[PDB]
């Protein structure tokens, strides 16, 4: 059968805790449209041991006048298109994060931080955010990167200028990441508006049109035992389903997981069989057309954006095509990456396929990794003395993070 | 003529009787087919709006397109159809089967074939005179390879 | 105005571009062939022959008369020494009418 | 205790026929347009992937096998020959269901 | 919990053979409306029941052209003025 | 040659339309309505010949026609029948 | 000014003969019979008719897409009103 989820966990703390050298230990923030993920950097610590606050970044409240239901135990969240775009629940999640990782004292947040952004971030959600940053929060100095540039750095061959492609997914987006001499080509950069959410929602609509039966008992957190355990990414996706159009090996590899049980009681309580549909809801970022919308996706965007290329900085890229983020989790993703690929290169040229240590966690150890080396880089960081001029859209272009574009917004 | 070759082909043949057909003035089209057992709607390509338009097929026909080569073949109209000559009823099963067919040509045949710019002509109308020994010494070696190599 | 045709190729082993002498576009353009067309070229002949539309196509329409075939599993290119068997009497034969041509 | 006890005003109303939540994404991307943009920059609008080159392929909707065929009826992709007797007894609330999955001639 | 999936009510009232309208204040509407015409009635329950059948199947045919009306018009929301529009087209509303 | 159903002139269609009390009329208006105005000789045509073809006759008559009407739910006077 | 049409739906309201040119119908008539089938002939009488109950019922369908207009806001009418018209009606 299924099984259902697990929440109210143990992150409670003292105030903060204390290193040596310079005493602020910074923290270490995700964002995620999925879920957010947090902690202090421990730093001097390499096997960094408790990350926390790897929630479900959705919310609600008690309109009886009760408690804010910030964090786990209709829904709203903080992010659309995965960019942050609101404040009156980004307010009470940010509160909730900061109750239980501790602040020091009183009414400021102590300690400097390092913060996701969006692949490319609008310059109005990046106001509004350093405006909630330093207007209510009011931190010391804080640095933004991107979760595939941080897992990058994280999983690097040496922390040197590398090249390569990122490849990366979530929950409406993955994108294409050139990057050069650890340089972001933000010009020829490109995403598709597709991912976890889309095929969540692809999977229950189909077992919601498949099984009339059930139509309340299948919800979004039972697509997820499915989705990220009995799924699979074909390695070619027409062989795939060529192969499940004979019964016997339909029969014997087919998914049959009961839902919750109380005619032999299984019109009822069914076994949800799955077998192409545990290949549809991967293929999405493959061939968006399984969905009604037209674009590229993965294959010919990443044929695309070579193309833009002379021949030689092709080479010495595509050496390091990284996987990571979200839908990359999927068992087979690399064998059917390294053939998508294998079928657009010059004939005999040479090309290596990397996965991520941790293809969810790694953005995080990243900007943890990050944060130890880069700790009083002073030049890199925003300080609070430069939001008391710079209008909140500014960003500086230090190494695994966003391009900045000169540009300044009229407010009032 | 008395030793023969044997060969398997497969092919995408599709059979129905045509429900309605479509066309506008490049071009775009529309067909449709129907079994016993299916129905089915079309968009055409050019080469079949060419050749279902060249043959004049009609709504209530029955019909083979070799999908291969966009020839067309009628079997007669459906008798639901008869009114207003040859009538029969529409195929059975799926509209696009992957038939086998086995084929069988003699080695002379195969001689007739490769001595002029159309050989089969010769094969019928008895042209086919003192044909170059060294023509049967490459074909007889090329057979005794397909041979052993499996596909005849 | 036409020194040369460049041409792309594709197999699921990768690809090449390739320099045709205008002899060759114009036994290309004798097949018929187009963008998207499986090809075989034996570029120590000039022989070409088109197998059929690449399957990536075979949605370009839901029925058309052209044959679909798989994008081949094979080398782009290939190479081997071969050895040919000719007899002074072919000679004799295939030079003294005019040819068919 | 409360990582502060006041709070800036960003952009939402106290009260009005105006949000409390500040712009949103479709109005953002519109809004930004009126900026000094050039051809050479990270701009948010010039990110999202082309269209698909090649012709998309068919998948039956009932059961995701490669499509042969399309219903004249109810207009959804099929495969096999008892696809096709299924379908036909299928009830319009889930036959518009396929089609608005993928965005069909009647949405 | 509030505010979300409104098709809970149409996976709920269209699954069987069933009829939406109960039984007991169905069969206190039509009597009085008869006798008007006609008083000292009395009905066969095959009788009465037989009118449900073809009302309720009336409105669901009138809510069907109803809402592709809205859409025309600009709107998500089926209003008055839909029904205005639908029944004198079809002629009835005349 | 006109026989694309264009022979039922913009003008013309234009006047049922204003007869029918309709104000501005866009470009597309006129071969839509020529579209209708086939389908309901599909009808009317069609079944008109069935009560033609019930005595077999070369010449179809007013009746034939208001027989096809009767059927179809548009009667009409003066022709009789 | 935009608008004296306003003064042609009077005209053509105060008007009651009908408005298609008889040779075209005519011609169109015989078209659509002789395809349907072979040495169908039509008295002037049943052309008549068949021309009376087609404009009668054009005006109808105008008629029925000018409400659709007005109940869509509009003061012109686009062939999706047609199309509504003859959805509403079951056409
Ligand atoms: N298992 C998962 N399933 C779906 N989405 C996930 C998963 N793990 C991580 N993500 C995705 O990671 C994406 C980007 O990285 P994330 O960790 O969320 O940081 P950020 O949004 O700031 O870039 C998000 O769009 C989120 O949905």
Same mark, same amino acid.
């Given at each position: 059968?299924?099984?259902?989820?697990?929440?109210?966990?143990?992150?409670?703390?003292?105030?903060?805790?204390?290193?040596?050298?310079?005493?602020?230990?910074?923290?270490?923030?995700?964002?995620?449209?999925?879920?957010?993920?947090?902690?202090?950097?421990?730093?001097?610590?390499?096997?960094?041991?408790?990350?926390?606050?790897?929630?479900?970044?959705?919310?609600?409240?008690?309109?009886?006048?009760?408690?804010?239901?910030?964090?786990?135990?209709?829904?709203?969240?903080?992010?659309?298109?995965?960019?942050?775009?609101?404040?009156?629940?980004?307010?009470?999640?940010?509160?909730?994060?900061?109750?239980?990782?501790?602040?020091?004292?009183?009414?400021?947040?102590?300690?400097?931080?390092?913060?996701?952004?969006?692949?490319?971030?609008?310059?109005?959600?990046?106001?509004?955010?350093?405006?909630?940053?330093?207007?209510?929060?009011?931190?010391?100095?804080?640095?933004?990167?991107?979760?595939?540039?941080?897992?990058?750095?994280?999983?690097?061959?040496?922390?040197?200028?590398?090249?390569?492609?990122?490849?990366?997914?979530?929950?409406?987006?993955?994108?294409?990441?050139?990057?050069?001499?650890?340089?972001?080509?933000?010009?020829?950069?490109?995403?598709?508006?597709?991912?976890?959410?889309?095929?969540?929602?692809?999977?229950?609509?189909?077992?919601?049109?498949?099984?009339?039966?059930?139509?309340?008992?299948?919800?979004?957190?039972?697509?997820?035992?499915?989705?990220?355990?009995?799924?699979?990414?074909?390695?070619?996706?027409?062989?795939?389903?060529?192969?499940?159009?004979?019964?016997?090996?339909?029969?014997?590899?087919?998914?049959?997981?009961?839902?919750?049980?109380?005619?032999?009681?299984?019109?009822?309580?069914?076994?949800?069989?799955?077998?192409?549909?545990?290949?549809?809801?991967?293929?999405?970022?493959?061939?968006?057309?399984?969905?009604?919308?037209?674009?590229?996706?993965?294959?010919?965007?990443?044929?695309?954006?070579?193309?833009?290329?002379?021949?030689?900085?092709?080479?010495?890229?595509?050496?390091?095509?990284?996987?990571?983020?979200?839908?990359?989790?999927?068992?087979?993703?690399?064998?059917?990456?390294?053939?998508?690929?294998?079928?657009?290169?010059?004939?005999?040229?040479?090309?290596?396929?990397?996965?991520?240590?941790?293809?969810?966690?790694?953005?995080?150890?990243?900007?943890?990794?990050?944060?130890?080396?880069?700790?009083?880089?002073?030049?890199?960081?925003?300080?609070?003395?430069?939001?008391?001029?710079?209008?909140?859209?500014?960003?500086?272009?230090?190494?695994?993070?966003?391009?900045?574009?000169?540009?300044?917004?009229?407010?009032? | 003529?008395?030793?023969?070759?044997?060969?398997?082909?497969?092919?995408?043949?599709?059979?129905?009787?045509?429900?309605?057909?479509?066309?506008?003035?490049?071009?775009?089209?529309?067909?449709?087919?129907?079994?016993?057992?299916?129905?089915?709607?079309?968009?055409?390509?050019?080469?079949?709006?060419?050749?279902?338009?060249?043959?004049?097929?009609?709504?209530?026909?029955?019909?083979?397109?070799?999908?291969?080569?966009?020839?067309?073949?009628?079997?007669?109209?459906?008798?639901?159809?008869?009114?207003?000559?040859?009538?029969?009823?529409?195929?059975?099963?799926?509209?696009?089967?992957?038939?086998?067919?086995?084929?069988?040509?003699?080695?002379?045949?195969?001689?007739?074939?490769?001595?002029?710019?159309?050989?089969?002509?010769?094969?019928?109308?008895?042209?086919?005179?003192?044909?170059?020994?060294?023509?049967?010494?490459?074909?007889?070696?090329?057979?005794?390879?397909?041979?052993?190599?499996?596909?005849? | 105005?036409?020194?040369?045709?460049?041409?792309?190729?594709?197999?699921?082993?990768?690809?090449?571009?390739?320099?045709?002498?205008?002899?060759?576009?114009?036994?290309?353009?004798?097949?018929?062939?187009?963008?998207?067309?499986?090809?075989?070229?034996?570029?120590?002949?000039?022989?070409?022959?088109?197998?059929?539309?690449?399957?990536?196509?075979?949605?370009?329409?839901?029925?058309?008369?052209?044959?679909?075939?798989?994008?081949?599993?094979?080398?782009?290119?290939?190479?081997?020494?071969?050895?040919?068997?000719?007899?002074?009497?072919?000679?004799?034969?295939?030079?003294?009418?005019?040819?068919?041509? | 205790?409360?990582?502060?006890?006041?709070?800036?005003?960003?952009?939402?109303?106290?009260?009005?026929?105006?949000?409390?939540?500040?712009?949103?994404?479709?109005?953002?991307?519109?809004?930004?347009?009126?900026?000094?943009?050039?051809?050479?920059?990270?701009?948010?609008?010039?990110?999202?992937?082309?269209?698909?080159?090649?012709?998309?392929?068919?998948?039956?909707?009932?059961?995701?096998?490669?499509?042969?065929?399309?219903?004249?009826?109810?207009?959804?992709?099929?495969?096999?020959?008892?696809?096709?007797?299924?379908?036909?007894?299928?009830?319009?609330?889930?036959?518009?269901?396929?089609?608005?999955?993928?965005?069909?001639?009647?949405? | 919990?509030?505010?979300?999936?409104?098709?809970?009510?149409?996976?709920?009232? %269209?699954?069987?053979?069933?009829?939406?309208?109960?039984?007991?204040?169905?069969?206190?509407?039509?009597?009085?409306?008869? %006798?008007?015409?006609?008083?000292?009635?009395?009905? %066969?329950?095959?009788?009465?029941?037989?009118?449900?059948?073809?009302?309720?199947?009336?409105?669901?045919?009138?809510?069907?052209?109803?809402?592709?009306?809205?859409?025309?018009?600009?709107?998500?929301?089926?209003?008055?003025?839909?029904? %205005?529009?639908?029944?004198?087209?079809?002629?009835?509303?005349? | 040659?006109?026989?694309?159903?264009?022979?039922?002139?913009?003008?013309?269609?234009?006047?049922?339309?204003?007869?029918?009390?309709?104000?501005?009329?866009?470009?597309?208006?006129?071969?839509?309505?020529?579209?209708?105005?086939?389908?309901?000789?599909?009808?009317?045509?069609?079944?008109?010949?069935?009560?033609?073809?019930?005595?077999?006759?070369?010449?179809?008559?007013?009746?034939?026609?208001?027989?096809?009407?009767?059927?179809?739910?548009?009667?009409?006077?003066?022709?009789?029948?």
């Amino acid at each position: 059968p299924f099984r259902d989820a697990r929440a109210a966990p143990d992150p409670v703390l003292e105030a903060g805790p204390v290193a040596h050298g310079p005493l602020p230990v910074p923290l270490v923030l995700d964002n995620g449209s999925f879920q957010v993920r947090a902690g202090w950097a421990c730093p001097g610590q390499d096997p960094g041991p408790e990350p926390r606050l790897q929630f479900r970044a959705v919310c609600a409240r008690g309109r009886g006048g009760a408690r804010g239901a910030s964090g786990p135990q209709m829904l709203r969240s903080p992010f659309d298109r995965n960019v942050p775009v609101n404040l009156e629940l980004q307010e009470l999640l940010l509160d909730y994060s900061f109750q239980h990782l501790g602040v020091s004292s009183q009414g400021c947040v102590d300690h400097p931080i390092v913060l996701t952004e969006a692949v490319c971030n609008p310059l109005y959600s990046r106001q509004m955010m350093s405006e909630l940053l330093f207007e209510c929060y009011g931190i010391p100095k804080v640095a933004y990167g991107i979760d595939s540039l941080f897992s990058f750095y994280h999983n690097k061959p040496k922390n040197s200028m590398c090249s390569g492609l990122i490849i990366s997914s979530g929950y409406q987006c993955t994108h294409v990441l050139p990057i050069l001499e650890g340089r972001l080509d933000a010009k020829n950069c490109k995403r598709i508006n597709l991912g976890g959410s889309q095929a969540a929602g692809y999977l229950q609509r189909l077992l919601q049109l498949k099984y009339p039966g059930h139509l309340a008992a299948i919800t979004l957190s039972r697509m997820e035992e499915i989705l990220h355990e009995h799924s699979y990414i074909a390695e070619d996706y027409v062989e795939e389903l060529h192969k499940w159009r004979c019964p016997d090996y339909y029969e014997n590899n087919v998914h049959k997981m009961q839902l919750p049980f109380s005619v032999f009681n299984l019109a009822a309580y069914h076994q949800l069989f799955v077998g192409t549909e545990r290949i549809r809801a991967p293929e999405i970022i493959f061939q968006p057309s399984l969905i009604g919308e037209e674009q590229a996706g993965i294959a010919e965007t990443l044929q695309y954006i070579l193309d833009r290329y002379p021949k030689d900085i092709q080479e010495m890229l595509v050496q390091n095509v990284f996987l990571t983020g979200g839908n990359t989790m999927y068992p087979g993703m690399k064998a059917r990456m390294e053939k998508e690929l294998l079928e657009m290169r010059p004939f005999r040229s040479s090309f290596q396929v990397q996965l991520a240590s941790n293809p969810v966690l790694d953005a995080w150890y990243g900007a943890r990794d990050w944060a130890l080396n880069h700790l009083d880089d002073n030049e890199v960081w925003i300080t609070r003395k430069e939001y008391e001029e710079k209008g909140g859209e500014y960003l500086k272009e230090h190494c695994a993070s966003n391009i900045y574009v000169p540009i300044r917004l009229p407010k009032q | 003529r008395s030793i023969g070759v044997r060969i398997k082909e497969e092919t995408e043949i599709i059979e129905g009787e045509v429900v309605e057909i479509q066309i506008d003035r490049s071009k775009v089209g529309k067909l449709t087919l129907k079994t016993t057992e299916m129905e089915t709607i079309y968009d055409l390509g050019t080469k079949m709006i060419e050749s279902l338009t060249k043959d004049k097929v009609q709504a209530g026909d029955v019909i083979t397109i070799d999908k291969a080569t966009g020839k067309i073949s009628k079997l007669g109209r459906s008798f639901t159809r008869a009114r207003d000559t040859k009538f029969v009823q529409c195929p059975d099963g799926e509209l696009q089967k992957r038939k086998e067919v086995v084929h069988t040509v003699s080695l002379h045949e195969i001689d007739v074939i490769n001595s002029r710019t159309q050989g089969f002509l010769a094969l019928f109308s008895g042209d086919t005179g003192e044909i170059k020994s060294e023509v049967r010494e490459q074909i007889n070696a090329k057979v005794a390879e397909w041979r052993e190599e499996g596909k005849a | 105005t036409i020194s040369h045709v460049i041409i792309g190729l594709k197999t699921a082993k990768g690809t090449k571009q390739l320099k045709l002498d205008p002899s060759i576009f114009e036994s290309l353009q004798k097949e018929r062939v187009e963008a998207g067309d499986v090809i075989y070229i034996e570029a120590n002949s000039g022989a070409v022959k088109r197998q059929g539309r690449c399957d990536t196509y075979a949605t370009e329409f839901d029925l058309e008369a052209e044959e679909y075939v798989p994008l081949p599993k094979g080398d782009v290119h290939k190479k081997k020494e071969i050895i040919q068997d000719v007899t002074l009497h072919d000679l004799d034969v295939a030079n003294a009418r005019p040819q068919g041509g | 205790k409360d990582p502060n006890f006041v709070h800036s005003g960003h952009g939402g109303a106290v009260a009005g026929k105006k949000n409390r939540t500040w712009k949103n994404l479709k109005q953002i991307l519109a809004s930004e347009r009126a900026l000094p943009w050039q051809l050479n920059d990270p701009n948010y609008f010039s990110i999202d992937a082309p269209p698909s080159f090649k012709p998309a392929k068919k998948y039956s909707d009932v059961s995701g096998l490669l499509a042969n065929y399309t219903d004249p009826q109810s207009k959804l992709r099929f495969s096999t020959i008892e696809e096709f007797s299924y379908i036909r007894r299928l009830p319009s609330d889930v036959v518009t269901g396929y089609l608005a999955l993928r965005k069909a001639t009647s949405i | 919990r509030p505010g979300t999936v409104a098709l809970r009510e149409i996976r709920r009232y %269209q699954k069987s053979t069933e009829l939406l309208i109960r039984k007991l204040p169905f069969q206190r509407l039509v009597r009085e409306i008869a %006798q008007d015409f006609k008083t000292d009635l009395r009905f %066969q329950s095959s009788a009465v029941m037989a009118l449900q059948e073809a009302c309720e199947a009336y409105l669901v045919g009138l809510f069907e052209d109803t809402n592709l009306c809205a859409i025309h018009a600009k709107r998500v929301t089926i209003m008055p003025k839909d029904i %205005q529009l639908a029944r004198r087209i079809r002629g009835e509303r005349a | 040659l006109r026989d694309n159903i264009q022979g039922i002139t913009k003008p013309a269609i234009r006047r049922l339309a204003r007869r029918g009390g309709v104000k501005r009329i866009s470009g597309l208006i006129y071969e839509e309505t020529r579209g209708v105005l086939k389908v309901f000789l599909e009808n009317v045509i069609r079944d008109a010949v069935t009560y033609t073809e019930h005595a077999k006759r070369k010449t179809v008559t007013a009746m034939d026609v208001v027989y096809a009407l009767k059927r179809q739910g548009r009667t009409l006077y003066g022709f009789g029948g």
